[PDB]
Amino acid sequence: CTTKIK
Amino acid sequence: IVGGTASVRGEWPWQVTLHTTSPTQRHLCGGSIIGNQWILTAAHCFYGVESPKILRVYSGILNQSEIKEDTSFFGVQEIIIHDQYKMAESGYDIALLKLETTVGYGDSQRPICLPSKGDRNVIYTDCWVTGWGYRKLRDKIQNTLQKAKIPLVTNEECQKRYRGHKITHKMICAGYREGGKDACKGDSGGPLSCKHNEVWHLVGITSWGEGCAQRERPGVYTNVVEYVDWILEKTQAV
Ligand SMILES: CCOC(=O)[C@H]1CCCC[C@H](NC(=O)/C=C/c2cc(Cl)ccc2-n2cnnn2)c2nc(c[nH]2)-c2ccc(NC(=O)OC)cc2N1
Secondary structure (H helix, E strand, C coil), rough: CCCCCE | CCCCCCCCCCCCCCCEEECCCCCCCCCEEEEECCCCCCCEHHHHHCCCCCCCCCCCCECCCEEEHCCCCCCCCCEEEEECCCCCCCHHHHCCCEEEEECCCCCEEECCCCCEEEECCHHHHHHCEEEEEEEEECCCCCCCCCCCEEEEECCEEHHHHHHHHHCCCCCCEEEEECCCCCCCCCCCCCCCCEEEEEEEEEEEEHHHEEEEECCCCCCCCCCCEEEEHHHHHHHHHCCCCC
């Protein structure tokens, strides 16, 4: 994904 | 889900079933895995929910019958509801569940990509609403996860359909003009998943509608692209 979640 | 069909196992691996144990254990809402300790769902699901201790998140589920007392689930550490939320019909219908432990990713459970800010102008033509909700207004929770392909509706057309409501750009609508396919009771909080350039994106969160699958009454979803900064604020907090 372009939008990244840690 | 009205007018849908049975999903196959592993088809929507970000789909979760959120259960409450109070007063007895039952399906409460749908949700989506967006991070290894994060579920995105609807704020209205927590009406009267006084504590995250009564919540159980089940992932990798096709059939509700897979859930018994010995079935593993994720506990919820925290419920984060958008500050501006009052009710589903006024928008900001979004919440995050911070899980007590991390989800181990695999072919049965993995995250769905959030929409990109640049993809606010992309036209999605392959959108699906999923859930264990009713097949009509007076029904019951379904055993098998259902799916229905539904077209996105412009904000202008959705506003014409909901006279007396204020349909904002923080909402996204989906439905056929003649009705027939839609989310229904028990589907809320679940995803509106759209495939673009071979990648699935979480475009909407099932929120509300006037009845289910009625002609000229599209389903109303939280427009996830408009909340990407809010999601990152809450999940990427230092
Ligand atoms: C456990 C308590 O849960 C609840 O009170 C609500 C909370 C959540 C309350 C709202 C929720 N709204 C939806 O899900 C979707 C609405 C909706 C969305 C779109 Cl896009 C279009 C049309 C829609 N509809 C208009 N009218 N109906 N739908 C709902 N959910 C329920 C009853 N209403 C429920 C029903 C059954 C169970 N569970 C069990 O029967 O388990 C055996 C849980 C529910 N969820």
